[model samples]
Target: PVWRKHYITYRINNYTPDMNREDVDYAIRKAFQVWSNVTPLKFSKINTGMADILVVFARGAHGDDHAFDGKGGILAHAFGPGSGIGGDAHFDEDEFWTTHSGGTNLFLTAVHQIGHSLGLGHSSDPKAVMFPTYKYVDINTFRLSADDIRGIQSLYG
Candidate 1:
């Protein structure tokens, strides 16, 4: 089931003041590029309100299958494809989201969350971006594992 379009849309929500908006957007775009670089899918940034996917940065927002705690447990969650919030991705605002290799890397985690938004489940492979646990990764050399590529292809191919 290859994705219908080469591009998808996304919007951002309330974010930590410490986090740079441009950096956040860059990380998100880079995350999607991780997949698009290997697969046929592409991503386009839409205006604030018009997006197929809403990439929200919040804490303790409920009314979904997953409930995010203040910290740990679940760092983020996303809805699968459909309407009215489907394909939306949410990150735990409480986490130390960052753009650098230091601190809790937002790029690594957002890459994983984006996988969920794209209809992927947690992967057992530690090397995979969809891996359930967060591992501080070197952003410069990061690449999707075989399982990750196969997983996305399975849903979007």
Candidate 2:
């Protein structure tokens, strides 16, 4: 598969009712920066115009062909690298997304989704952030599991 360019730009198009602007911005940045520490990937937030990755909070059937499944099942999804829809991450608005409130471990979820956005798919390892299902690890104590580091490095490097 195609990996994102070494440098990537993303926008927090909106914040959901579940989280505030401060948490949304910081968690997203946290997701990118921590991933960068393990791989060659880099990301910046842009205030105006388009970006390499467009992040948004969306509800069920929000324009894209992919449909959301309420608050618990399938929290969000992201596109593989390319143009337009590529690198975009659409999070299900109904979920209790938080870092602002760890109702759902927004940090872990977004980091996993971004893995998809950067062109890595689900991993069989339950401990990997890119694992198909969601899991909550203490964000302040979280480190990219060995499998995650190896997978993204293999793709980006």
Candidate 3:
């Protein structure tokens, strides 16, 4: 389900040692903006306490049924909007997360997962951010596809 309100909050509960702290923050903020840009939704980052969406990093079995499978397979996963575990996103620490195309792009992955956090499901369109498979797009020039915009706008537009 979609969030009941337009103003949403998220928190980076932890950071991966693989990436610089500031870069992690920047990637996440940009990811949120991918959706906020298309909808009336507004995202605020909080340092502590409960947040609507809790961003986290983990290895193998990380308290959820869907465990991380080393580096290549599943990069991350997230829950739809609600409370508690809902809207929470978990990244696989095994993957060498990066800001660019060299490794699994954190910004792109977060953008996809955050779409899930906002209650968006996978799209059949390969160009869509919500596409099931992950691919690296030029971060500097990346823009959401019409499919991506249409999906989010349908929910929060």
Which candidate tops TM-score?
3
Q: Which stretch of 10 consecutive residues in model 2 shows the poorest summed lDDT?
A: 98-107
Per-residue lDDT for 9 in model 2? 90
Q: What is the TM-score of each candidate against the true structure?
A: 0.88, 0.93, 0.97
> Which pairs in model 3 have colliding backbones?
none
Model 1 lDDT per residue over 1-157, tens place: 2236667877775566557888888888888788778777878877766687888777775667566788666777788765668778888877777788555677788788778777788889899888888888777788899999999888776
lDDT of 1 at 27: 85
Tell me the number of clashing residue pairs for each predicted model.
Answer: 4, 0, 0
TM-score of 3: 0.97
Best by lDDT: 3
RMSD of each: 2.0, 1.5, 0.8
Candidate 2 TM-score to native: 0.93
The per-model lDDT (C-alpha) reads 0.77, 0.84, 0.92
Order of candidates by TM-score, top first? 3, 2, 1
